Design a protein around this ligand. Structure first.
Ligand code: ZN
Ligand code: ZN
Ligand code: ZN
Lengths: 68, 45, 1174
DNA sequence: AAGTACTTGAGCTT
DNA sequence: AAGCTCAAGTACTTAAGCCTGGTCA
RNA sequence: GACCAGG
C-alpha cells in the first residue's frame, strides 16, 4: 500500500520522498535519474521509491460510506 | 437499537432486533456494521 | 524499457472511463464469455431446441388384428425458443422497483447469480392451431460480464462505482458465492474421419480387429455424437454407434444400401473406384458384398422396414406414427448428423470405407489421436448449451410420460384441446430445470441420460480460487484432458509431443500427479468460437477446376477434398496444393482488406479457416484436402512472409508448413511463414519469468507452478469479497527486472512480491540445504507482511430442527448475559465489536432459542489471535425476513515467521531460517546490509544461472533508474546478456562481473574473495503456520476403537505405522513398538474367561449384596443356570434378575481396544476367536 | 491394463 | 463306449507414504 | 465417504 517508510536494507527515511518524487516525473520531463536530486546515493534506498506501487490510490475509491 | 450501513446506498438505517432487514430507501438486502469508538492497544512491532 | 509510472498513477487516481486499460486480459478471457455470447446470440439454443423436434401423446386403442390402431386425440408439442432474461430482483415483484442485481450482491448475499429462464411452448391438437404459451422454468446461472450480465462493456469507472475491481475480467458462474468455472476439456477433432489401432477393439469382438475408423460428427448446434467403424477379420465392417448408454452394432453395407436406393455396382465403384481391379480392395469388397447378400434384403423400403422393426423399442419415438419414416429417422438421427443431405452422407461413407480398407491395406499410417493435431477444445458455454438442451429434452419427455399416465389411469380428465388440462399436467410434474443447472455448477456431476460423447461424467467444474492473480488467469486459460487417461499409468499422452508449437505451452504444466496432463494454452492461441459462412467456398472450389462426378467415376491419381465433413469434389494432388496456396492468399488478402479502408462484404474465405492440405507419401497419413471452418478449435497467429500481413492457422498446418521462428533464420524456397516473436510461443504465467531461457526446464516448471501460489495482491476490491481465505501482501512492489509483456498485461496493478538485495554467500552457516536467511532489520521494518482474511459465516436457518417456525435470532434475549467475556466482545446485538482482538476461546456471535430463552454461544474456533474487520448482516432474500445469516471477516496477521517459504523467480523455494540480526550480517563498501542471503551451493545441480543473470540485471536497473527488459530469446550468443548488463554496471561504478567486496560482520575483516550481490524479486509463498505445527498431548477419541481422531481440526493425532513399524522392528526396539503402537494410543484393561477362552462372555456381577465387596466379574458362557441349591458364595445375579453358577475364571488382561472391536465385528460374522491364557 | 490362478469342454486312446 | 490329459475361456484382487485445505449431498 | 485442489 503506502510507501514503505524507512526502506528495507538501509535505514534512511523515504516516507516524504515519494510525493516529491512523483512531481518530478510529472513536471520536470526527467527520467528515472530524477530521484538522484532527492539525496539517494545507495541502490538499496533507491529501489524503494523508484519501483514502488502506490496501490492505495486505487483502493481508497471503495468507501462503503459513500453516501451516494 | 443499533446503527448499520446500506451496502449500496450507504444510509444509516437504525434497525431494531427481530426485524425485516432491508435498506429503508434502497431496497437492498445487505448491511455492514460500523466501527464505533473503542480503545484498543497494539504494540508497535 | 522504462517504468510506466506516470501512466500508472494517472490511471489509479481517476480510472479510465473510455476503455478498459489493458485489453489483452480481455482477449485472454475471450474463450468462455464468447462461448456464452454465442449461446445467447448467433442462434445456438434455438437450433438445439428445434432439433429436439416434437413430442407426442395420444389415446391408444389397440390395433387388434388391424395393425393400424386408430387414435384421434394426438398432441405433439414443440418448443419454439428459449429466453434467458437479465437477472432481475427475486422472482416476484415485491413492493418496489424490480431492480437489476449486479454480481456484487451475488458475492455478498452468499447466493448464486440466477435469472429467469423462459420457454415458448407450442401445441398441436391433431390439427394446426399451434397456440403457444410462455413458461417460467426456474432460474439458471449467468456468466459475469457475459451478454447476459449487467457489466458487459461497462467502463471501469462504472465498475469501481459498483463493487467489482477495475480490470474485472468476468467469465465465472457464481454459485453460493464460490466462483465456479467450466474447465476446457480436449476432444477428438470434429468431422474428420480418423483411424484407430487400439487392442480392445478386436478382443471385444473376437472376429474383430484393432483396425477401426472413428469420426466425431457434430450438428450445426454443437450436439455432437460419435459413430465408429469396427472392422472384423472376415472382411465385413460393423458400423458402431452408441445410443442412450447402449452400444449398437450394425453392418456398413446394410446402412449404405439403406441410405440411398442404389445399385451395388455404384457401391463398388465408390469403394474401389480406381485402377480397376486392384486385388486387395476388389477382393475384400467382394467378400463384404456376398456377406451382406447372405441374410439381408434388396430394396431401400425392405431394408428400412428391417431396421425400423428392429429399433422401434429402444427409440423413444412416437409409438404409432410410422415405420418407414422411422427408418428415414434413424438415418437422420444417429448415422451421420453433420451432413444434412442424404446423398452426401452416402458419398462420405464411401470415402470412409475406402479409407478404412486403405488402413488395413497398410498404405495409411496409424493416426495418433492423442496429439494436439487431431484435438480440439470444448469451451464452457458449448457444454452449458448442450446440458441445457438435454435437460429440456428430459423435461419434454417427462411431461409426455405424464400425459401418457393420465391416459393410462383410466381417463380422469381427457380433452387434449382444453388448456385447463395442460395447466394441471404442468402442475403435477417438476417444472424446474434451473436448479438442475445450479446443482451441476455446484458439484459437476453431469447427470444426463446420454453422455453426449464425453467419457468421464464428473469433474467438469473447478472453483476459481482468486488466491493470486496468476492463479486467476491460469484458471481461465488452462485445459485438462480428463481423469480417464489420468488414472492410467503410462509415459503416454502426458508427453509434450511437438505439434503444439505456439498452441499449448510446453513449459508450464504443474508438478505432481497431474504433471503433463493439463497443458495451459499458449500466450496467443485463441479459441475461435464464432463460426462463419462458407457456401462461397464450394462455389469457388468448383469454380477453380475441381468438380464432383455425378456419374460414378474415380481414378488413381485423383484425391479427395472435403469441407469439414462434406465431399465437394476430387483433385489431382498438385492441383490440391495449388488450391491451398491460392485460397490462403485470398484469405490473407481479403482479411487485411477488411481491417483497413476497403468496405466489408461477406467474407469470401473466413480468416479462421485453416486449409488442411495433406500431402501424399508412402506409409503416410491419408491425404484428403481438409477445409475446416467450425468453431471449438485452436487457432494461432503468425506473420506471412510472401505478403507482409497477419495470417492464422490451426493444428494441421503446423505439421506441414515450414514455419521459420526467426526473421534471420528464413531460408527461401521453403519457409512459408515467420513467427511474430517466439515469446508468442509460451503461456502467460510462464512468459513473465525473466531469462526463462537460461534455466533448466524443470526449474522453470517449478517457478511457474509455484508462482501461481504467491501471497500476492488478489486484486484491489477486498471490502466486498466474501471469499473464504484471501491473502494480501501488505507491501508488494514492481520487479526491477520485468519482461515488457509484464507491463502490457498490466500486472503492475497486481504486484506479487518485493525486491531484495540478495547476496549470494555461504556465511551464516544456517543457510545450507536449500534454505536461506532474512535480515532481521528488514524483517521488522516491513518485509513481506502477510495478512490473511478468513471470512466465516453463521446461518441460523440450518440449525433449526424442523416443524416449528423460525425460532432463533441474533442478540441478547431478554434476560441476563455474562459480563466476563460476552459483554466485552459482543456489542449488544450479538454481533461482535468491530476490530476487537479475538483469542481462540472467545465468542464471535450470540444467538438464542425462543423456547428456552437462554442465549447460546459460538466461539472463535481458530487457534491463533485474529482480528475482526467487517460483519455483514446478510439479509435473507427479496425481503420481509429476519437477519438469518451473519458473515464475519477475520483479519489474521502473519509476519514472516521462521518456516515461511520464500522464492525467487526461478524455482529456489526456501525457508526463512534464522532471521539473522542486522548488525551481524555482512556489508559492502557502501553500507547496504544484504537483506536476504541465498546459498551458493544451490545453483549447480539446479542450473538456475538465469538467477545470477537476474542479479546482474537488478543491480543495473536499480542504479541508473531503468527497468531491464528480460523477455526470453532476446539476447543471442554473439553478445551475451551478461556482457550488456556488465557494460551497464561498470558504467554505474560497480564491478563488471557483478562482484562486490564485503567485510564480514562478526570479525570486521574483509572476505578474502569478493561476494555477489544482486537485486532479485522474492515473491513470498504461502505455507507458513496453518500447515506447519500440530501437537497432540491428550485429546478427543474415536467412537469405535478409542484411537485418536484424524484431525488437525479435532486435535487429530499423527499416523505411525505400516512402515514406521518396519523402521523400529529393524532397529530392534520391540519395546518402542509395543509402546507407541499400543500404549500411547489405545490402552485398556479387559477381562477374559480362562475356562472358555472368550472375551465377549464376561459380565460384571450386579446385586451381589449390600455395599460389601466389589463387583467381581464372571463368565456367562461357562456358567450354568441357578436351578438347584448351591452355596451363597459362587452364585451371583443378573440385571434382569437371573442368578447363575459358574464362570469364575476371569482374569484381567491388557488388550488394545481395536481387538475388542474386531471381536465384536467378527462374532457378528458368527465366528469368534478363542484366546487362551496360561 | 496386468496377470494371476480357476474350471469347463472337446478331442484321442484302451 | 468312456476315461483322462489337453486347449482356450470365465471369474477376480492391487496398483507408495503421509500431511493439509476446500465443496458436497 | 465422494470429486477438484496443494505440499
Ligand atoms: Zn536503505
Ligand atoms: Zn440500500
Ligand atoms: Zn467361561
Amino acid at each position: 500500500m503506502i510507501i514503505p517508510i524507512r526502506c528495507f536494507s538501509c535505514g534512511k527515511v523515504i516516507g516524504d520522498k515519494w510525493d516529491t518524487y512523483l512531481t518530478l516525473l510529472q513536471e520536470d520531463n526527467t527520467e528515472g535519474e530524477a530521484l538522484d536530486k532527492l539525496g539517494l546515493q545507495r541502490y538499496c534506498c533507491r529501489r524503494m521509491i523508484l519501483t514502488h506501487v502506490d496501490l492505495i490510490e486505487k483502493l481508497l475509491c471503495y468507501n462503503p460510506l459513500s453516501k451516494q | 437499537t443499533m446503527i448499520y450501513l446500506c451496502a449500496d446506498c450507504g444510509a444509516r438505517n437504525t434497525i431494531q432486533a427481530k426485524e425485516v432487514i432491508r435498506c429503508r430507501e434502497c431496497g437492498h438486502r445487505v448491511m455492514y456494521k460500523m466501527r464505533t469508538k473503542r480503545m484498543v492497544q497494539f504494540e508497535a512491532r | 524499457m522504462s517504468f510506466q509510472t506516470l501512466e500508472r498513477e494517472r490511471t489509479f487516481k481517476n480510472p479510465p472511463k473510455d476503455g478498459t486499460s489493458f485489453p489483452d486480459l480481455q482477449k485472454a478471457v475471450k474463450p468462455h464469455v464468447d462461448s456464452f455470447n454465442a449461446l445467447t446470440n448467433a442462434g445456438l439454443l434455438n437450433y438445439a431446441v428445434k432439433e429436439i423436434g416434437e413430442k407426442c401423446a395420444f389415446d391408444s386403442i389397440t390395433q387388434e388384428e388391424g395393425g393400424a390402431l386408430k387414435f384421434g386425440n394426438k398432441i405433439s408439442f414443440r418448443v419454439d425458443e428459449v429466453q434467458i432474461a437479465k437477472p432481475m430482483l427475486s422472482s416476484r415483484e415485491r413492493s418496489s422497483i424490480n431492480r437489476k442485481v449486479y454480481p456484487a450482491e451475488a458475492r455478498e448475499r452468499l447466493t448464486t447469480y440466477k435469472s429467469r429462464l423462459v420457454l415458448k411452448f407450442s401445441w398441436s391438437v391433431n390439427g394446426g392451431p399451434r397456440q403457444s404459451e410462455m413458461r417460467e422454468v426456474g432460474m439458471i446461472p449467468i456468466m459475469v460480464r457475459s451478454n447476459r450480465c449487467h457489466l458487459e462493456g461497462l467502463s471501469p469507472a462504472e465498475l469501481i462505482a459498483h463493487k467489482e475491481e477495475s480490470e474485472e475480467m468476468g467469465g465465472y458462474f457464481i454459485v453460493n458465492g464460490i466462483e465456479k468455472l467450466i474447465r476446457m476439456l480436449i476432444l477428438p477433432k470434429r468431422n474428420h474421419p480418423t483411424a484407430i489401432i487400439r487392442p480392445s477393439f478386436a478382443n471385444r469382438g473376437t472376429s474383430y480387429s484393432q483396425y477401426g475408423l472413428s469420426i466425431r460428427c457434430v450438428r450445426p448446434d454443437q450436439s455432437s455424437l460419435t459413430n465408429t467403424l469396427h472392422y472384423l477379420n472376415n472382411g465385413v465392417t460393423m458400423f458402431r454407434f452408441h445410443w442412450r448408454k447402449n452400444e449398437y452394432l450394425i453392418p456398413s453395407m446394410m446402412i449404405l444400401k439403406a441410405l440411398l436406393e442404389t445399385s451395388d455396382k455404384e457401391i463398388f465403384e465408390g469403394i474401389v473406384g480406381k485402377d480397376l481391379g486392384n486385388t486387395f480392395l476388389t477382393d475384400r469388397v467382394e467378400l463384404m458384398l456376398r456377406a451382406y447378400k447372405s441374410y439381408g434384403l434388396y430394396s431401400q423400403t425392405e431394408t428400412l422396414q428391417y431396421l425400423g422393426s428392429k429399433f422401434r423399442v429402444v427409440l423413444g419415438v412416437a409409438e404409432d406414427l410410422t415405420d418407414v419414416e422411422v427408418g428415414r429417422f434413424l438415418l437422420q438421427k444417429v448415422v451421420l448428423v453433420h451432413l444434412r443431405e442424404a446423398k452426401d452422407k452416402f458419398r462420405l461413407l464411401l470415402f470412409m470405407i475406402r479409407k478404412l480398407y486403405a488402413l488395413v491395406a497398410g498404405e495409411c499410417c496409424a493416426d495418433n489421436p492423442d496429439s494436439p493435431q487431431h484435438q480440439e477444445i470444448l469451451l464452457g458455454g458449448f457444454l452449458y448449451g448442450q446440458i441445457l438442451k438435454e435437460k429440456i429434452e428430459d423435461w419434454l419427455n417427462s411431461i409426455r410420460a405424464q400425459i401418457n399416465l393420465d391416459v393410462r389411469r383410466s381417463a380422469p380428465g381427457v380433452d387434449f384441446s382444453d388448456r385447463k388440462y395442460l395447466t394441471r399436467v404442468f402442475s403435477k410434474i417438476n417444472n424446474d430445470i434451473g436448479t438442475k443447472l445450479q446443482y451441476f455448477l455446484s458439484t459437476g456431476n453431469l447427470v444426463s441420460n446420454t453422455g453426449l460423447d464425453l467419457q468421464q461424467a464428473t469433474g467438469y467444474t473447478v472453483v476459481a480460487e482468486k488466491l493470486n492473480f496468476y492463479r486467476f488467469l491460469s484458471h481461465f486459460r488452462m485445459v485438462h484432458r480428463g481423469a480417464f487417461f489420468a488414472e492410467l499409468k503410462t509415459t503416454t499422452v502426458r508427453k509434450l509431443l511437438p505439434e503444439a508449437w505456439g498452441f499449448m505451452c510446453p513449459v508450464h504444466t504443474p508438478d505432481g500427479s497431474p504433471c503433463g496432463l493439463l497443458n495451459h494454452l499458449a500466450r496467443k492461441c485463441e479459441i475461435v468460437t464464432h463460426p462463419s459462412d462458407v457456401s462461397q467456398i464450394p462455389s469457388l472450389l468448383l469454380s477453380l477446376g475441381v468438380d464432383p462426378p455425378s456419374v460414378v467415376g474415380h481414378e488413381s491419381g485423383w484425391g479427395c477434398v472435403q469441407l469439414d465433413g462434406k465431399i465437394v469434389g476430387w483433385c489431382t494432388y498438385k492441383l490440391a496444393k495449388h488450391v491451398a496456396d491460392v485460397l490462403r492468399l485470398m484469405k490473407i488478402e481479403y482479411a487485411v482488406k477488411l481491417r483497413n479502408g476497403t468496405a466489408t462484404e461477406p467474407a469470401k474465405v473466413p480468416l479462421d479457416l485453416e486449409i488442411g492440405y495433406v500431402p501424399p507419401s508412402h506409409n503416410g497419413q491419408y491425404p484428403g484436402l481438409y477445409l475446416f471452418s467450425n468453431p471449438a478449435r485452436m487457432v494461432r497467429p503468425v506473420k506471412h512472409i510472401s505478403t507482409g500481413e497477419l495470417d492464422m492457422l490451426g493444428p494441421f498446418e503446423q505439421v506441414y508448413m515450414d514455419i521459420a521462428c526467426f526473421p534471420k533464420e528464413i531460408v527461401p524456397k521453403v519457409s512459408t511463414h515467420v513467427e511474430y516473436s517466439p515469446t508468442n510461443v509460451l503461456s502467460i504465467v510462464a512468459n513473465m519469468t525473466p531469462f526463462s531461457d537460461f534455466n533448466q526446464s524443470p526449474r522453470n516448471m517449478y517457478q511457474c507452478q509455484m508462482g501461481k501460489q504467491t501471497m500476492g495482491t488478489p486484486g484491489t476490491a477486498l471490502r466486498y469479497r466474501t471469499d473464504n481465505k484471501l491473502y494480501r501482501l501488505q507491501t508488494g512492489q514492481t520487479p526491477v527486472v520485468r519482461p515488457k509483456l509484464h507491463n502490457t498485461y498490466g500486472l503492475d496493478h497486481y504486484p506479487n512480491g518485493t525486491n531484495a538485495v540478495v547476496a549470494v554467500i555461504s556465511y551464516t552457516g544456517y543457510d545450507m540445504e536449500d534454505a536461506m536467511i532474512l535480515n532481521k532489520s528488514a524483517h521488522e521494518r516491513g518485509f513481506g507482511y502477510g495478512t490473511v482474511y478468513k471470512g466465516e459465516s453463521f446461518d441460523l436457518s440450518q440449525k433449526r430442527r424442523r416443524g416449528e417456525p423460525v425460532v432463533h435470532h441474533f442478540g441478547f434475549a431478554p434476560g441476563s448475559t455474562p459480563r466476563r467475556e460476552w459483554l466485552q466482545k459482543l456489542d449488544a446485538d450479538g454481533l461482535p465489536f468491530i476490530g476487537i482482538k479475538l483469542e481462540d476461546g472467545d465468542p464471535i456471535v450470540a444467538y438464542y432459542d425462543e423456547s428456552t430463552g437462554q442465549n447460546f454461544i459460538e466461539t472463535y474456533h481458530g487457534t491463533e489471535p485474529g482480528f475482526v474487520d467487517e460483519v455483514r448482516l446478510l439479509g435473507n432474500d427479496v425481503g420481509d425476513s429476519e437477519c438469518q445469516q451473519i458473515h464475519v471477516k477475520l483479519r489474521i496477521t502473519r509476519s514472516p515467521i521462521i518456516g515461511d517459504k520464500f522464492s525467487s523467480r526461478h524455482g529456489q523455494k526456501g525457508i526463512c531460517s534464522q532471521k539473522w540480526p542486522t548488525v551481524d550480517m555482512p556489508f559492502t563498501e557502501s553500507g547496504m546490509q544484504p537483506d536476504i542471503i541465498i546459498n551458493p551451493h544451490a545453483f549447480p545441480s539446479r542450473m538456475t544461472i538465469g538467477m545470477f543473470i537476474e542479479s546482474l540485471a537488478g543491480k543495473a536497473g536499480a542504479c541508473h533508474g531503468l527497468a531491464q527488459d528480460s523477455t526470453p530469446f532476446i539476447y543471442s550468443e554473439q553478445q551475451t546478456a551478461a556482457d550488456y548488463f556488465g557494460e551497464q554496471l561498470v558504467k554505474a561504478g560497480y564491478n563488471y562481473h557483478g562482484n562486490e567486496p564485503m567485510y564480514s560482520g562478526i570479525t570486521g575483516q574483509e572476505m578474502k574473495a569478493d561476494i555477489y550481490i544482486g537485486v532479485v524479486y522474492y515473491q513470498r509463498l504461502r505455507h507458513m503456520v496453518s500447515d506447519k505445527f500440530q501437537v497432540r498431548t491428550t485429546g478427543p477419541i474415536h467412537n469405535l476403537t478409542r484411537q485418536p481422531v484424524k484431525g488437525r481440526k479435532r486435535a487429530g493425532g499423527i499416523r505411525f505405522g505400516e512402515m514406521e513399524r518396519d523402521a523400529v522392528i529393524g532397529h530392534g526396539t520391540s519395546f518402542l513398538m509395543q509402546d507407541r503402537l499400543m500404549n500411547c494410543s489405545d490402552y485398556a484393561q479387559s477381562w477374559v474367561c480362562r475356562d472358555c477362552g472368550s472375551i465377549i462372555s464376561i459380565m460384571s456381577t450386579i446385586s451381589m449384596n449390600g455395599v460389601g465387596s466389589a463387583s467381581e466379574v464372571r463368565c456367562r458362557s461357562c456358567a450354568k443356570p441357578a436351578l438347584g441349591l448351591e452355596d451363597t458364595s459362587d452364585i451371583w445375579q443378573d440385571g434382569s434378575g437371573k442368578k447363575f453358577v459358574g464362570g469364575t475364571n476371569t482374569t484381567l488382561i491388557a488388550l488394545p481396544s481395536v481387538f475388542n472391536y474386531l471381536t465384536a465385528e467378527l462374532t457378528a460374522m458368527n465366528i469368534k476367536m478363542m484366546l487362551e491364557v496360561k
